[PDB]
Amino acid sequence: ASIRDQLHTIVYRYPPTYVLSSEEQDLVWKFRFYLSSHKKALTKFLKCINWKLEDEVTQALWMLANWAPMDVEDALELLSPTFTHPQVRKYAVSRLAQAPDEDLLLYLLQLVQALKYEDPRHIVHLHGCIFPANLCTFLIQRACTNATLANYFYWYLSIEVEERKQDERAHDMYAMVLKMFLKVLENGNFNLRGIFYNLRKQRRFIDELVKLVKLVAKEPGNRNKKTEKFQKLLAEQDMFKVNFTNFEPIPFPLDPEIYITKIVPMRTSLFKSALMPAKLTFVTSIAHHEYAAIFKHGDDLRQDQLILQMITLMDKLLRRENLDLKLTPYKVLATSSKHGFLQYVDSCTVAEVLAREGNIHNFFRKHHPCDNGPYGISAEVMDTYIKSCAGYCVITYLLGVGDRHLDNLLLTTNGKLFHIDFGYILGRDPKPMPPPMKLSKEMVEAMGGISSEHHHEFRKQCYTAYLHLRRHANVMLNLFSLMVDATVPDIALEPDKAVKKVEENLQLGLTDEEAVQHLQSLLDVSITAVMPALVEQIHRFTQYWR
């Protein structure tokens, strides 16, 4: 029938972590031979066969070789811990190889995590080959071809390697992977050797930077005294193995593409933030262009990088759809945990804006005034602000960010708001009862209250964003499937529910009409609870029945 396939389009193309396929498995088994439709299909057939019969393997493997080729994102799942079979894993690696480098970088964090799942004997056989395509040989081969990839690959492995349970099994494995990668570069040729020297430079440079930060932390003083001490140390030359006011050009670790040269001491500040991170500036190799970054000594950033990848990727997904909310997905890396960098975007924390200029409208109006509309605020600015908001409420909801407040959100003079400091993930909040959506009175007034052409514009935008994201779920879920054993604090409290929790937020059961209605619901409770008048109005309604 058509009803026969109608049952199948639902299964071929709905969730990638459902067990649900039970009797259904056999239905696919037979139509499978006739219609190996698309890449989407292959992921589903694989799930049922391998483990139970020794012979099934032979028939399915032949199907896979002929099958319409899997998409890189669907391929990720195969590297998951659920699929053991050595033959299918090789296939996934072949899919990755076909993908362009830009795509490889997004996932790289996941792939590094993926190493655990891939079998130990593959890692040791290679070690034997060097010292006295399987995935891991592959990651190294590619890391070497392209300099930026080498940089990221190195920094991810390095966080893993530094110093119990399963931790010994994985630390030992990663330690080994890194040693092999460094030995391949030391040996390679000009280009490979060249990569090796630049890493050496990055590594040496940070240690000196870290040494310096540690001296600043010791000397006692309020922030201002501490920052003055910081300015002086950088400008002290030959106190340090690297001399800051000038050095030899180093590929910035945060961005390999840009070299640095010097740092400018006067331009460096420290943040109000309770862990006291520097801003730094550098000049860089071309026409003394500034760059700044932050550099943070007190926390581990691994969790923050994961979320930023999550935001970075989501923005890409919507931009492909031609939905562009002006989100800022700033670069994080951590170095070895407890330090890291972050890209700095010029912005102002919301609370700063409110203390310094009465309300948000005044602030845009100051930077971008246009008498006519909408608020004497240049039209675009308003629009970009509306869009940035929609983008974040939906993105925050899916990732269950919590512990948001005025210190945590910022504005820009263009308009965008963005978030920062995702210390609390997947519904952990220090307060007993978060609102489902995280908006502020200050922010809603920015839109003009409930009927604004503008507020209506915002809700509409969230709905379309939510719907678009629901569609691209498979990619996000597999990426989380791969962070099970991640060593992100928020994930570790219950790793099993890590992926289960994002699925619930995604609300994949419901129809589109239903999904919007459900989301619509969350915004409303949150906005009513935020607005002073809306609560007065509800008290009045309670009063009506007396």
Ligand X SMILES: COc1ccc2c(nc(NC(=O)c3cccnc3)[n+]3cc[nH]c23)c1OC
Which positions touch ligand X (CB under 6 A)? 271, 273, 277, 294, 304, 330, 342-345, 347-349, 352, 410, 420-421
| Residue number, 69 or 436, with CB nearest to a second copy | 436
What whole-number distance in Å separates Cα of residue 299 and Cα of residue 425? 15
Handedness of CA 26, 29, 35, 36 (dihedral sign): positive
C-alpha span between 213 and 349 (Å, rounded): 25
Q: Is 544 in the site for a second copy (CB under 8 A)?
A: yes
Q: How far is CA 408 from the centre of its chain?
A: 17
Q: How far is the CB of 451 from a second copy (least distance, A)?
A: 13
Residue 61 site contact among ligand X, a second copy, none (CB < 5 to 8 Å, cut-off depends on kind) = none
178 vs 348, beta carbon nearer ligand X: 348
Given ligand X, a second copy, none, residue 55, with its beta carbon under 5 to 8 Å by kind, binds: none
- The reply on whether position 520 binds a second copy by CB under 8 A is yes
Q: Does 516 bind a second copy (CB under 8 A)?
A: yes
| Other beta carbons within 10 Å of 346 | 9
**Is residue 451 close enough to count as binding a second copy by CB under 8 A?**
no
Burial of 429 (0-12, 13-18, 19+ CB in 10 A): middle
Check binding of 407 to a second copy (CB under 8 A): no
Q: Which of a second copy, ligand X, none binds 544 (CB below 5-8 Å, type-dependent)? A: a second copy
Which residues make Cβ contacts (< 8 Å) with residue 68, sequence separation at least 6?
A: 36, 37, 38, 39, 41, 42
Q: Shortest approach of ligand X to residue 294 CB, angstroms?
A: 5
The number of residues that bind a second copy (CB under 8 A) is 31
Q: Nearest-CA neighbor of 437 among 452, 459, 410, 460?
A: 459
- Kind plus residue range of the DSSP H or E element containing 290: strand 290-296
Binding-site partner at residue 431 among ligand X, a second copy, none, CB < 5 to 8 Å by type? a second copy
Sheet holding 290-296, edge to edge: 250-251, 259-263, 278-284, 290-296, 340-343, 332-333
434 binds, among ligand X, a second copy, none (CB under 5 to 8 A by kind): a second copy
Q: Which of 116, 433, 449, 486 binds a second copy (CB under 8 A)?
A: 433
Distance, CA of 489 to CA of 284 (rounded, Å): 35
Residue 344: contacted member of a second copy, ligand X, none (CB under 5 to 8 Å, by partner type): ligand X
Count the neighbouring beta carbons within 10 Å of the beta carbon of residue 166: 9
**What is the per-residue DSSP string for 376-408?**
SB-HHHHHHHHHHHHHHHHHHHHTT-B---TTT
CA 533 → CA 11, 457, 537, 541, distances in Å? Answer: 47, 21, 6, 13
- Given the complex with a second copy, which of 386 and 409 has the nearer CB atom? 409
Instruction: Indicate the residue among 323 and 348 with the shorter CB distance to ligand X.
Output: 348
CB 39 within 8 A of CB 69: yes
530 touches a second copy (CB under 8 A): yes
Under rule CB under 8 A, residue 445 binds a second copy: no
Q: Which stretch binds a second copy (CB under 8 A): 54-62, 276-284, 486-494, 532-540?
A: 532-540
**For a second copy, which stretch binds (CB under 8 A), given 11-19, 155-163, 227-235, 428-436?**
428-436
Residue in 53, 68, 275, 538 binding a second copy, rule: CB under 8 A? 538
The answer to whether 297 and 275 have CB atoms below 8 angstroms apart is yes
Angle at 157 between CA 154 and CA 163, to 5 degrees: 130
- Residue from 440, 464, 487, 507 touching a second copy (CB under 8 A): that is 440
Residue 540 contacts a second copy per CB under 8 A: yes
Pick the closest to residue 253 from 213, 295, 288 (CA basis).
295
Q: In what order do the strands lie in the sheet with 409-411?
A: 348-349, 409-411, 417-419
Q: Which does 273 bind (CB under 5 to 8 A by kind): ligand X, a second copy, none?
A: ligand X
- When asked if residue 541 is in the footprint of a second copy (CB under 8 A), the reply is yes
Could you tell me the smallest distance in angstroms from the CB atom of residue 542 to a second copy?
5
The one of ligand X, a second copy, none whose footprint includes residue 526, by CB under 5 to 8 A per kind, is a second copy
> Cβ of residue 278: shortest distance to ligand X, in angstroms?
11
Q: Contact, 329 vs 310, CB < 8 A?
A: no
| Stretch of 251-259, 388-396, 412-420, 534-542 lying at the interface with a second copy (CB under 8 A) | 534-542
DSSP state string for 418-443:
EE----B-TT--SSS---SS---HHH
Q: What residues from 364 to 393 belong to the interface with a second copy (CB under 8 A)?
A: none
Site of interaction with a second copy (CB under 8 A): 405-406, 431-435, 440-441, 513, 516-517, 520-521, 524-526, 528-530, 532, 535, 537-545
